[PDB]
């Protein structure tokens, strides 16, 4: 019954600009998390109680539901943070929860894959995954930021990098994606980065750390699958960075044949794949829209695809 | 898995005009029911599988869900009707199902009453009850009509009365409602019937048999509750019948104080009551709209309420 009571509370949202602005600040941050996390968690548990019956009964969905109830119990059992010793122990609980739930997206994807087909309105699944995954991103950002306030890392204020270079973060994920792709196909497309390659601004890397490898793996696979006769010489994937006062734009352009007309209306659905998870595109778009940006696709059937990632700047 | 297969089939709808138009017709009717009933039932079972998890888990909701699966099993186990002896036994199954499920509305109302409060979007409950109760009405009409084709009742073709008198059916339910009301309050309002009191036309009485006592019990209770100082002399409930080529209109006008402005936006919700079931108004409106008509309310706060029941004629 505690879930219904806590879910009726508002929810004080923290904007990345508020996050940017002795150890007294650690106690105020700890107390904010103590009051905020159970409220966000209770809304998500209410979302699990509302899922279509045949889906809620799935053993994997039930397991994630139990994990989330257990997380609510541990957080609500923690006594109010009064001093530094209390805040240090609360950090341990936050680390444990971050670790215990690192594979939640995989569990949700597999628990929903077959059960999803036995319901009358599949759009409930899109709403549920969008709400759950974006709240999970927001929760993981608040939790990781609080922990990182205990570090003395240059160019960082918690998880906010004060001098983020989009070129360097893109390069980090290009090297990761090229290695996965070379392991499966024997080669990977070269990536050229152009535009505002020297841009540097305050930014939270965490959402880029999910979106970028997802969009890079897609562009590289499409390129390899459409050039099977010449895997040793495939067209480059071209990334353009456009930086302005309102937003950061990253366009990832490939020559991997495009997204077919018959598939275009389904690529943004969870579980849809032409391979195998089918989560990269709908999750990337939900994450981007949650942070005030967008993910837009331009398909040139027979040639390739342009993917546009737009993320807002920190005021 | 048989439910998902049968739910993908279309559904041949029977219009009351088709119903109006040796015993060969009994075998054709039996075979129609044999193919039609499991299709309608499979869609309703899919609706139960899609209900919010906390509702689907309710013991009473689970019981109705089990009853409906068992009904699907018995109907799908029945071998194809080839002769008169097969059709006679199928009639026994239809009587048993009509009897086993006579209290379904009560079970659904009580299984949904508390569980309803623990979900994020209560409008799913309105859609579910509207879809389930109207399909149940349609199924009970098809089943009762087939059985009544075995009777030789004057002025009837199955459940279709060829010379239905709205005044006589209104009077039948006025006597029933006045008795319930006199038992609780010591008196009941007199009912005057005016308008097309001599009208006679082909019509199916069954939906009037649900709607009329529901609207009569409401008008009588409102009248008694707003005249507690003079229960021996309360204003009459006035019913007007308007018959034309397109529809039959029955207006039930009372002087029971009206429906308050603060309640008006909730009276059409299932479970809403100022007493105690809270199903009479939303069920009556779902039934009327299902048959091509409507139920409209006009409230005169401080004076009384006019309820307008409109039902289409049989072409
Ligand atoms: N750059 C791209 N070029 C061509 N097709 C693409 C591209 N990105 C995505 N797609 C198509 O969209 C589908 C869904 O992508 P995604 O959600 O990442 O799932 P997955 O990668 O598991 O298939 C892919 O299977 C593929 O058919
Ligand atoms: N004729 C009427 N006059 C005044 N109030 C009415 C009338 N009919 C219905 N109501 C109001 O609408 C509510 C809902 O009616 P209904 O769905 O029949 O449920 P119940 O009869 O169980 O209360 C009633 O409790 C009452 O407040
Ligand atoms: C989708 O919303 C929920 C939720 F309902 C929940 F019960 C737990 C978590 C959650 C983590 C995660 O699912 O990955 S990590 C983490 C770190 C914390 F300190 C507190 C909570 C969490 C969450 F996101
Ligand atoms: C809401 O739709 C359903 C349903 F899913 C179901 F399983 C059974 C019935 C049902 C009756 C009832 O619920 O009252 S009576 C009856 C007589 C029959 F011959 C065949 C079926 C029924 C029904 F309506
Ligand atoms: K997809
Ligand atoms: K009501
Ligand atoms: Mg992908
Ligand atoms: Mg009533």
XYZ file of C-alpha atoms and ligand atoms in Angstrom:
736
model
C 0.000 0.000 0.000
C 3.047 2.314 0.467
C 3.509 2.417 -3.362
C 0.046 4.002 -3.908
C 0.755 6.624 -1.228
C 4.243 7.602 -2.529
C 3.031 7.594 -6.208
C 0.524 10.372 -5.335
C 3.425 12.770 -4.533
C 4.433 15.347 -7.194
C 8.167 14.879 -8.316
C 10.775 17.690 -8.116
C 12.551 17.561 -11.505
C 16.240 18.522 -11.635
C 17.381 20.417 -14.727
C 21.033 19.995 -15.925
C 21.604 23.736 -15.263
C 20.520 23.293 -11.592
C 22.924 20.260 -11.437
C 25.808 22.464 -12.725
C 25.220 25.026 -9.913
C 33.248 21.309 3.361
C 30.936 18.623 1.886
C 27.618 20.302 2.832
C 26.406 20.062 -0.820
C 26.796 16.224 -0.594
C 24.252 16.105 2.280
C 21.780 18.335 0.409
C 22.215 16.113 -2.717
C 21.801 12.930 -0.643
C 18.602 14.258 0.967
C 17.204 15.261 -2.454
C 17.772 11.676 -3.773
C 16.242 10.240 -0.602
C 12.987 12.098 -1.229
C 12.996 11.991 -5.058
C 13.979 8.379 -5.921
C 11.062 6.574 -4.117
C 8.510 8.909 -5.797
C 9.876 8.128 -9.291
C 10.138 4.430 -8.423
C 6.509 4.274 -7.098
C 5.191 5.717 -10.407
C 7.147 2.990 -12.309
C 5.858 0.216 -10.010
C 2.289 1.519 -10.678
C 3.146 1.180 -14.426
C 4.029 -2.536 -13.857
C 0.715 -3.099 -11.987
C -1.108 -1.626 -15.034
C 0.657 -3.766 -17.708
C -1.608 -6.188 -19.680
C -2.204 -9.321 -17.557
C -0.551 -11.831 -19.910
C 2.594 -9.593 -19.962
C 2.669 -8.986 -16.185
C 2.490 -12.786 -15.650
C 5.654 -13.399 -17.751
C 8.413 -14.804 -15.440
C 11.007 -12.257 -16.651
C 8.626 -9.272 -16.325
C 7.678 -10.522 -12.793
C 11.400 -10.725 -11.912
C 12.021 -7.045 -12.946
C 8.774 -6.080 -11.091
C 10.140 -7.871 -7.911
C 13.586 -6.165 -8.340
C 11.823 -2.767 -8.484
C 9.684 -3.475 -5.382
C 12.850 -4.604 -3.531
C 14.610 -1.362 -4.668
C 11.666 0.695 -3.301
C 11.822 -1.225 0.007
C 15.610 -0.693 0.468
C 15.359 3.030 -0.375
C 12.312 3.599 1.893
C 13.975 1.585 4.731
C 17.055 3.886 4.681
C 16.816 6.345 7.603
C 16.946 10.122 6.930
C 20.489 11.317 6.131
C 21.607 13.477 9.066
C 25.421 13.447 8.674
C 28.455 12.506 6.467
C 28.552 8.882 7.769
C 24.859 8.372 6.777
C 25.468 9.866 3.294
C 28.507 7.572 2.793
C 26.387 4.482 3.502
C 23.577 5.737 1.239
C 26.212 5.939 -1.576
C 26.841 2.165 -1.078
C 23.104 1.452 -1.520
C 23.069 3.611 -4.679
C 26.115 1.694 -6.107
C 24.432 -1.655 -5.313
C 21.160 -0.584 -7.043
C 23.051 0.731 -10.094
C 24.836 -2.654 -10.357
C 21.806 -4.911 -9.591
C 19.765 -3.258 -12.357
C 22.438 -2.836 -15.111
C 20.742 -5.505 -17.338
C 17.108 -4.306 -16.927
C 16.720 -3.358 -20.652
C 17.687 -6.887 -21.723
C 15.271 -8.469 -19.225
C 12.415 -6.157 -20.352
C 13.161 -6.822 -24.026
C 13.049 -10.611 -23.582
C 10.095 -10.655 -21.154
C 8.073 -8.585 -23.656
C 9.138 -10.258 -26.951
C 6.593 -13.141 -27.111
C 3.995 -11.995 -24.511
C 3.587 -8.739 -26.545
C 1.851 -10.748 -29.318
C -1.067 -11.905 -27.117
C -2.552 -8.469 -26.328
C -5.239 -6.435 -28.113
C -3.394 -3.050 -28.243
C 0.400 -3.335 -28.748
C 0.770 0.487 -28.408
C 0.545 -0.004 -24.599
C 4.014 -1.697 -24.906
C 5.482 1.356 -26.695
C 4.132 3.721 -23.960
C 5.359 1.417 -21.173
C 8.877 0.961 -22.597
C 9.194 4.712 -23.390
C 8.078 5.720 -19.858
C 10.116 2.997 -18.016
C 13.393 3.336 -20.014
C 13.484 7.179 -19.903
C 12.635 7.251 -16.137
C 15.388 4.610 -15.707
C 17.844 6.899 -17.640
C 16.867 9.903 -15.456
C 17.212 7.852 -12.260
C 20.614 6.445 -13.314
C 21.791 10.019 -14.180
C 20.675 11.377 -10.735
C 22.333 8.404 -8.951
C 25.608 8.495 -10.973
C 25.819 12.316 -10.606
C 25.485 12.107 -6.788
C 28.254 9.440 -6.585
C 30.526 11.438 -8.948
C 30.152 14.529 -6.699
C 32.490 12.511 -4.324
C 35.235 12.401 -7.080
C 37.772 15.154 -7.947
C 37.938 14.586 -11.686
C 39.252 17.474 -13.824
C 36.705 19.010 -16.247
C 33.776 17.445 -14.328
C 31.037 18.533 -11.922
C 29.486 15.175 -11.013
C 28.566 13.607 -14.357
C 28.555 16.988 -16.182
C 31.700 17.406 -18.274
C 32.407 21.185 -18.389
C 34.453 20.943 -21.641
C 32.836 18.032 -23.530
C 34.242 17.420 -26.989
C 31.642 15.765 -29.277
C 34.461 14.681 -31.676
C 36.303 12.743 -28.874
C 33.145 11.020 -27.588
C 32.210 10.113 -31.201
C 35.723 8.688 -31.767
C 35.512 6.636 -28.572
C 32.323 4.921 -29.817
C 33.560 4.629 -33.445
C 36.580 2.556 -32.169
C 34.199 0.367 -30.120
C 31.724 -0.180 -33.007
C 34.503 -0.792 -35.609
C 35.923 -3.570 -33.386
C 32.520 -5.328 -32.974
C 31.917 -5.029 -36.759
C 35.457 -6.275 -37.720
C 34.921 -9.321 -35.456
C 31.739 -10.343 -37.364
C 32.535 -9.273 -40.956
C 36.344 -9.172 -41.184
C 36.288 -5.385 -41.858
C 34.427 -2.204 -40.809
C 33.744 1.077 -42.616
C 36.085 4.008 -41.977
C 34.429 6.926 -40.192
C 35.118 10.501 -41.220
C 34.119 13.246 -38.806
C 33.555 16.777 -40.169
C 31.890 20.073 -39.146
C 32.507 21.652 -35.739
C 35.269 19.163 -34.802
C 36.790 21.713 -32.347
C 33.547 22.380 -30.365
C 33.737 22.207 -26.555
C 30.872 22.948 -24.180
C 29.329 21.766 -20.869
C 27.428 18.506 -21.401
C 26.399 15.225 -19.747
C 28.040 12.361 -21.734
C 25.827 9.498 -20.340
C 22.952 9.611 -22.964
C 25.527 9.977 -25.823
C 27.167 6.812 -24.379
C 23.946 4.893 -25.154
C 22.775 6.536 -28.389
C 26.056 6.779 -30.315
C 27.117 3.039 -30.258
C 23.526 2.136 -31.112
C 23.436 4.373 -34.206
C 27.046 3.429 -35.170
C 26.372 -0.347 -34.963
C 23.309 0.155 -37.241
C 25.197 2.206 -39.890
C 28.155 -0.269 -39.914
C 25.942 -3.377 -40.161
C 23.844 -1.861 -42.996
C 27.076 -0.955 -44.813
C 28.550 -4.477 -44.422
C 25.291 -6.327 -45.295
C 24.899 -4.318 -48.518
C 28.529 -4.859 -49.710
C 28.997 -8.631 -49.096
C 30.931 -9.101 -52.407
C 33.564 -6.460 -51.449
C 33.913 -6.479 -47.591
C 37.512 -5.189 -48.033
C 36.283 -1.900 -49.631
C 33.048 -0.469 -48.293
C 31.883 3.203 -48.300
C 32.799 5.359 -45.308
C 30.274 6.351 -42.654
C 30.308 10.172 -42.507
C 29.532 12.037 -39.293
C 28.873 15.792 -39.249
C 28.840 17.827 -35.992
C 26.907 21.122 -36.015
C 27.153 23.161 -32.832
C 25.083 26.271 -32.151
C 23.552 28.145 -29.158
C 20.342 26.132 -29.069
C 21.415 22.531 -29.791
C 24.180 20.061 -30.732
C 23.421 18.180 -33.985
C 25.155 14.943 -34.954
C 24.300 13.541 -38.385
C 25.496 9.958 -39.109
C 25.348 9.299 -42.882
C 25.930 5.920 -44.387
C 25.762 4.240 -47.812
C 24.248 0.993 -46.546
C 21.257 0.809 -48.937
C 18.674 2.670 -46.838
C 15.594 1.518 -44.915
C 13.014 0.006 -47.279
C 9.571 1.579 -47.735
C 7.847 -1.564 -46.367
C 10.019 -1.429 -43.157
C 10.015 2.358 -42.540
C 6.758 2.333 -40.530
C 8.133 -0.414 -38.177
C 11.845 0.467 -37.563
C 10.791 2.710 -34.632
C 8.884 -0.162 -32.943
C 10.513 -2.030 -30.069
C 11.497 -5.619 -31.037
C 11.437 -4.828 -34.810
C 14.591 -6.069 -36.543
C 15.567 -7.318 -40.017
C 18.355 -9.515 -38.509
C 18.489 -8.918 -33.404
C 17.270 -7.087 -30.311
C 15.354 -4.315 -32.131
C 15.757 -1.745 -29.332
C 18.461 0.660 -30.622
C 16.241 3.020 -32.638
C 13.116 3.294 -30.344
C 15.315 3.603 -27.199
C 17.613 6.243 -28.814
C 14.583 8.329 -29.847
C 12.894 8.018 -26.405
C 16.193 9.080 -24.705
C 16.698 12.066 -27.056
C 13.085 13.314 -26.676
C 13.266 12.850 -22.882
C 16.241 15.285 -22.794
C 14.544 17.892 -25.041
C 16.038 16.754 -28.344
C 15.055 14.382 -31.170
C 16.113 11.498 -33.443
C 15.053 11.804 -37.097
C 15.647 9.424 -39.966
C 16.033 10.197 -43.674
C 16.037 7.120 -45.893
C 17.363 7.128 -49.471
C 16.290 3.658 -50.618
C 18.926 2.085 -52.827
C 21.681 4.411 -51.442
C 21.792 4.888 -47.637
C 20.442 6.594 -44.534
C 21.035 9.888 -42.703
C 20.336 9.779 -38.975
C 20.009 13.129 -37.158
C 20.632 13.265 -33.413
C 19.753 16.609 -31.785
C 20.371 17.340 -28.119
C 19.744 20.603 -26.270
C 22.544 22.576 -24.640
C 22.715 23.302 -20.880
C 21.310 26.908 -20.500
C -3.244 -21.065 -28.198
C -6.673 -21.812 -29.792
C -7.984 -18.434 -28.466
C -5.394 -16.439 -30.494
C -6.265 -18.399 -33.650
C -10.081 -18.028 -33.319
C -9.776 -14.300 -32.315
C -8.124 -13.574 -35.707
C -11.370 -14.559 -37.525
C -13.691 -11.750 -38.736
C -17.248 -12.008 -37.092
C -20.484 -12.242 -39.145
C -22.841 -9.734 -37.466
C -26.577 -10.499 -37.477
C -28.906 -7.522 -37.888
C -32.418 -7.673 -36.278
C -33.957 -7.448 -39.792
C -32.001 -10.580 -40.892
C -33.251 -12.280 -37.644
C -36.886 -11.406 -38.570
C -36.509 -13.100 -42.005
C -39.828 -28.691 -41.397
C -37.189 -27.352 -38.953
C -34.430 -26.737 -41.550
C -34.048 -23.095 -40.343
C -33.170 -24.453 -36.833
C -30.142 -26.320 -38.279
C -28.962 -23.249 -40.220
C -29.372 -21.129 -37.020
C -27.544 -23.749 -34.922
C -24.638 -23.871 -37.399
C -24.418 -20.048 -37.448
C -24.127 -19.984 -33.597
C -21.562 -22.789 -33.720
C -19.268 -20.710 -35.923
C -20.095 -17.250 -34.505
C -20.078 -17.737 -30.694
C -16.421 -18.966 -30.317
C -15.158 -16.016 -32.437
C -16.956 -13.461 -30.219
C -15.862 -15.327 -27.086
C -12.163 -15.456 -28.206
C -12.127 -11.641 -28.677
C -13.515 -11.245 -25.100
C -10.953 -13.689 -23.647
C -8.206 -11.625 -25.400
C -9.726 -8.562 -23.611
C -9.267 -10.353 -20.220
C -5.613 -11.184 -21.087
C -5.061 -7.445 -21.788
C -6.626 -6.127 -18.523
C -4.221 -4.278 -16.138
C -2.228 -6.873 -14.144
C -3.503 -5.912 -10.676
C -7.115 -6.236 -12.001
C -6.532 -9.542 -13.837
C -5.072 -10.996 -10.595
C -8.275 -10.222 -8.610
C -9.877 -13.562 -7.509
C -13.333 -12.575 -8.839
C -11.982 -11.334 -12.203
C -9.933 -14.599 -12.490
C -13.116 -16.608 -11.779
C -15.058 -14.867 -14.643
C -11.942 -15.296 -16.884
C -11.944 -19.101 -16.041
C -15.754 -19.317 -16.683
C -15.207 -17.727 -20.125
C -12.320 -20.085 -21.023
C -14.486 -23.057 -19.925
C -17.370 -21.693 -22.100
C -14.980 -21.477 -25.101
C -13.794 -25.058 -24.453
C -17.358 -26.508 -24.255
C -18.465 -24.660 -27.417
C -15.319 -25.634 -29.394
C -15.603 -29.279 -28.164
C -19.174 -29.567 -29.561
C -19.063 -31.498 -32.862
C -20.502 -29.909 -36.047
C -24.325 -29.955 -36.074
C -25.374 -32.398 -38.806
C -28.978 -33.228 -37.796
C -31.983 -32.407 -35.503
C -30.662 -34.599 -32.623
C -27.310 -32.688 -32.638
C -29.111 -29.298 -32.667
C -31.323 -30.397 -29.726
C -28.248 -31.219 -27.623
C -26.541 -27.948 -28.614
C -29.667 -26.140 -27.243
C -28.970 -27.804 -23.832
C -25.392 -26.436 -23.861
C -26.731 -22.964 -24.750
C -29.271 -23.118 -21.833
C -26.503 -24.222 -19.426
C -24.194 -21.344 -20.535
C -27.028 -18.792 -20.264
C -27.689 -20.014 -16.689
C -24.019 -20.382 -15.568
C -23.259 -16.784 -16.578
C -26.473 -14.984 -15.420
C -24.575 -13.146 -12.596
C -21.495 -12.074 -14.639
C -22.258 -8.302 -14.309
C -22.298 -8.572 -10.506
C -19.019 -10.528 -10.460
C -17.345 -7.996 -12.816
C -18.646 -5.054 -10.779
C -17.272 -6.442 -7.501
C -13.987 -7.755 -8.953
C -13.314 -4.291 -10.430
C -14.514 -2.064 -7.533
C -11.305 -1.906 -5.414
C -8.679 -3.166 -7.932
C -9.762 -0.309 -10.293
C -8.152 2.218 -7.893
C -4.606 0.802 -8.243
C -4.120 1.465 -11.980
C -2.663 4.471 -13.819
C -5.445 4.928 -16.451
C -8.976 4.139 -15.173
C -10.426 4.740 -18.695
C -9.218 1.204 -19.608
C -11.970 -0.044 -17.186
C -14.670 1.954 -19.029
C -13.545 0.512 -22.428
C -13.347 -3.029 -21.012
C -16.775 -2.941 -19.324
C -18.405 -1.307 -22.402
C -16.900 -3.913 -24.785
C -17.532 -6.955 -22.482
C -21.111 -6.056 -21.374
C -22.359 -5.152 -24.898
C -20.759 -8.305 -26.449
C -22.391 -10.259 -23.575
C -25.800 -8.641 -24.451
C -25.341 -9.523 -28.161
C -24.314 -13.096 -27.313
C -27.258 -13.566 -24.911
C -29.645 -12.180 -27.610
C -28.267 -14.612 -30.283
C -28.483 -17.551 -27.816
C -31.989 -16.695 -26.475
C -33.284 -16.068 -30.040
C -32.062 -19.504 -31.238
C -33.752 -21.262 -28.259
C -36.996 -19.273 -28.763
C -37.106 -20.378 -32.439
C -38.116 -23.810 -30.895
C -41.233 -22.175 -29.236
C -44.622 -21.430 -30.885
C -45.432 -18.223 -29.043
C -48.016 -15.903 -30.650
C -46.675 -12.491 -31.783
C -43.056 -13.757 -31.668
C -40.325 -14.812 -34.098
C -37.650 -16.064 -31.692
C -37.059 -13.150 -29.315
C -38.500 -10.574 -31.774
C -42.002 -9.526 -30.736
C -43.850 -8.624 -33.986
C -46.391 -6.355 -32.191
C -44.416 -4.914 -29.245
C -46.296 -2.359 -27.183
C -43.889 0.088 -25.465
C -46.693 1.113 -23.024
C -47.173 -2.534 -21.810
C -43.435 -3.192 -21.383
C -43.093 0.149 -19.521
C -46.026 -0.805 -17.245
C -44.486 -4.205 -16.519
C -41.283 -2.544 -15.236
C -43.144 0.305 -13.446
C -45.011 -2.351 -11.322
C -41.676 -4.071 -10.561
C -39.861 -0.819 -9.618
C -42.820 0.530 -7.546
C -42.779 -2.684 -5.461
C -38.997 -2.479 -4.757
C -39.374 1.240 -3.861
C -42.475 0.687 -1.606
C -40.534 -2.031 0.274
C -37.700 0.419 1.155
C -39.566 3.737 1.592
C -43.170 2.794 2.426
C -44.439 4.444 -0.809
C -43.470 4.917 -4.486
C -44.255 7.658 -7.008
C -47.184 7.140 -9.382
C -46.159 6.807 -13.025
C -48.130 8.493 -15.779
C -47.519 7.338 -19.337
C -48.393 9.704 -22.214
C -47.646 10.171 -25.943
C -47.947 7.297 -28.418
C -49.522 4.919 -25.857
C -51.171 2.894 -28.689
C -47.938 2.269 -30.701
C -47.213 -1.312 -31.812
C -44.265 -2.393 -33.943
C -41.737 -5.253 -34.347
C -39.089 -5.056 -31.613
C -36.754 -7.128 -29.418
C -37.827 -6.593 -25.757
C -34.585 -7.949 -24.117
C -32.546 -4.636 -23.957
C -35.676 -2.726 -22.734
C -35.892 -5.401 -19.979
C -32.493 -4.213 -18.679
C -32.638 -0.458 -19.324
C -36.175 0.349 -18.153
C -35.986 -1.037 -14.525
C -32.576 0.610 -14.207
C -33.874 4.062 -15.203
C -37.133 3.571 -13.206
C -35.296 2.576 -9.983
C -33.126 5.736 -10.338
C -36.096 8.119 -10.878
C -38.071 6.561 -7.954
C -35.117 6.636 -5.526
C -34.277 10.279 -6.400
C -37.950 11.180 -5.881
C -38.136 9.421 -2.476
C -34.745 10.728 -1.213
C -35.722 14.329 -2.024
C -39.174 14.148 -0.312
C -38.305 12.429 3.021
C -40.683 14.725 5.019
C -43.722 13.747 2.867
C -43.181 10.114 1.633
C -47.005 9.751 1.409
C -47.242 12.472 -1.314
C -44.396 12.637 -3.800
C -44.456 13.991 -7.405
C -45.304 11.557 -10.199
C -42.687 10.184 -12.578
C -43.867 11.066 -16.107
C -43.012 8.875 -19.087
C -43.555 10.048 -22.674
C -43.430 7.634 -25.658
C -42.667 9.139 -29.086
C -42.817 6.707 -31.986
C -41.714 7.562 -35.518
C -40.212 5.809 -38.598
C -36.602 6.180 -37.507
C -36.641 5.539 -33.734
C -38.642 4.878 -30.543
C -38.083 7.576 -27.876
C -38.900 7.053 -24.204
C -38.438 10.071 -21.935
C -38.597 9.398 -18.151
C -39.095 12.708 -16.285
C -38.923 12.993 -12.555
C -39.010 15.718 -9.880
C -36.324 14.159 -7.692
C -34.033 17.215 -7.366
C -31.754 16.600 -10.361
C -28.122 15.490 -10.656
C -25.795 18.037 -9.038
C -23.199 19.941 -11.081
C -20.329 18.383 -9.068
C -21.664 14.819 -9.813
C -22.696 15.274 -13.482
C -19.230 14.442 -14.874
C -19.127 11.132 -12.873
C -22.695 9.661 -13.062
C -21.763 7.916 -16.351
C -18.735 6.193 -14.737
C -19.024 2.566 -13.660
C -19.039 2.179 -9.834
C -20.068 5.853 -9.271
C -22.985 6.124 -6.840
C -24.274 8.655 -4.288
C -25.836 5.827 -2.183
C -25.010 1.289 -4.455
C -23.761 -0.663 -7.461
C -23.252 2.334 -9.789
C -23.797 0.347 -13.007
C -27.328 1.334 -14.155
C -26.454 4.494 -16.108
C -23.140 3.442 -17.843
C -24.568 -0.024 -18.718
C -27.869 1.447 -20.059
C -25.942 3.888 -22.280
C -23.520 1.186 -23.557
C -26.520 -1.099 -24.376
C -28.434 1.692 -26.179
C -25.395 2.798 -28.252
C -24.574 -0.844 -29.094
C -28.059 -1.190 -30.684
C -27.796 2.085 -32.666
C -29.560 4.330 -30.159
C -28.546 6.575 -27.241
C -29.137 7.546 -23.593
C -29.065 11.290 -22.850
C -29.516 13.083 -19.560
C -30.937 16.553 -18.903
C -30.482 17.750 -15.332
C -32.506 20.606 -13.813
C -30.696 21.051 -10.492
C -33.138 21.828 -7.710
C -36.096 20.338 -9.696
C -35.500 16.961 -11.415
C -34.090 15.006 -14.339
C -35.250 14.037 -17.843
C -33.741 10.823 -19.181
C -34.070 10.168 -22.936
C -33.856 6.595 -24.210
C -33.715 6.281 -28.016
C -33.697 2.942 -29.807
C -33.716 2.327 -33.560
C -36.553 0.503 -35.298
C -36.099 -2.784 -37.216
C -35.831 -1.727 -40.948
N 21.492 2.952 -40.808
C 20.580 2.037 -41.152
N 20.524 1.634 -42.442
C 19.616 0.715 -42.793
N 18.709 0.103 -42.028
C 18.787 0.520 -40.758
C 19.666 1.460 -40.247
N 19.445 1.655 -38.892
C 18.454 0.841 -38.619
N 18.007 0.124 -39.699
C 16.901 -0.829 -39.741
O 16.073 -0.636 -38.605
C 15.948 -1.873 -37.870
C 15.783 -1.570 -36.401
O 17.014 -1.069 -35.835
P 17.309 -1.210 -34.262
O 16.166 -0.685 -33.479
O 18.678 -0.697 -34.029
O 17.352 -2.800 -34.079
P 18.420 -3.968 -34.466
O 19.736 -3.247 -34.669
O 18.467 -4.931 -33.296
O 17.905 -4.605 -35.735
C 17.193 -2.656 -38.261
O 17.073 -4.065 -38.069
C 17.331 -2.299 -39.743
O 16.404 -3.019 -40.553
N -33.105 10.303 -12.066
C -32.056 10.653 -11.316
N -32.166 11.739 -10.517
C -31.120 12.093 -9.760
N -29.922 11.512 -9.667
C -29.840 10.441 -10.467
C -30.831 9.956 -11.305
N -30.385 8.840 -11.998
C -29.157 8.680 -11.569
N -28.761 9.610 -10.644
C -27.454 9.734 -10.006
O -26.495 9.006 -10.757
C -25.833 8.042 -9.909
C -25.447 6.835 -10.728
O -26.615 6.072 -11.106
P -26.494 4.508 -11.453
O -25.425 4.289 -12.456
O -27.867 4.010 -11.696
O -26.001 3.901 -10.056
P -26.714 3.609 -8.619
O -28.198 3.582 -8.915
O -26.198 2.269 -8.134
O -26.322 4.755 -7.717
C -26.829 7.804 -8.784
O -26.240 7.286 -7.592
C -27.397 9.208 -8.569
O -26.497 10.041 -7.839
C 12.647 2.514 -13.953
O 12.754 3.139 -12.679
C 13.416 2.419 -11.701
C 12.763 1.721 -10.702
F 11.421 1.660 -10.694
C 13.476 1.061 -9.730
F 12.798 0.336 -8.804
C 14.842 1.079 -9.714
C 15.533 1.788 -10.694
C 17.018 1.915 -10.600
C 17.940 1.507 -11.530
C 17.732 0.836 -12.860
O 16.677 0.296 -13.153
O 18.774 0.726 -13.647
S 19.573 1.978 -11.100
C 19.020 2.732 -9.629
C 19.812 3.409 -8.704
C 19.171 3.965 -7.616
F 19.935 4.584 -6.669
C 17.818 3.891 -7.413
C 17.051 3.208 -8.340
C 17.630 2.622 -9.464
C 14.801 2.438 -11.683
F 15.452 3.093 -12.662
C -18.819 -11.575 -22.877
O -18.828 -12.601 -23.861
C -18.999 -13.892 -23.394
C -17.957 -14.789 -23.246
F -16.696 -14.397 -23.492
C -18.196 -16.073 -22.820
F -17.139 -16.903 -22.629
C -19.461 -16.506 -22.539
C -20.538 -15.635 -22.693
C -21.929 -16.146 -22.511
C -22.862 -15.693 -21.615
C -22.758 -14.596 -20.591
O -21.680 -14.147 -20.233
O -23.863 -14.229 -19.988
S -24.422 -16.464 -21.829
C -23.817 -17.432 -23.146
C -24.553 -18.339 -23.905
C -23.890 -18.983 -24.929
F -24.577 -19.917 -25.651
C -22.571 -18.770 -25.233
C -21.856 -17.871 -24.462
C -22.460 -17.182 -23.411
C -20.282 -14.332 -23.110
F -21.304 -13.464 -23.225
K 13.508 -1.542 -33.937
K -22.805 5.298 -12.107
Mg 20.585 -1.580 -33.698
Mg -29.283 2.880 -10.581
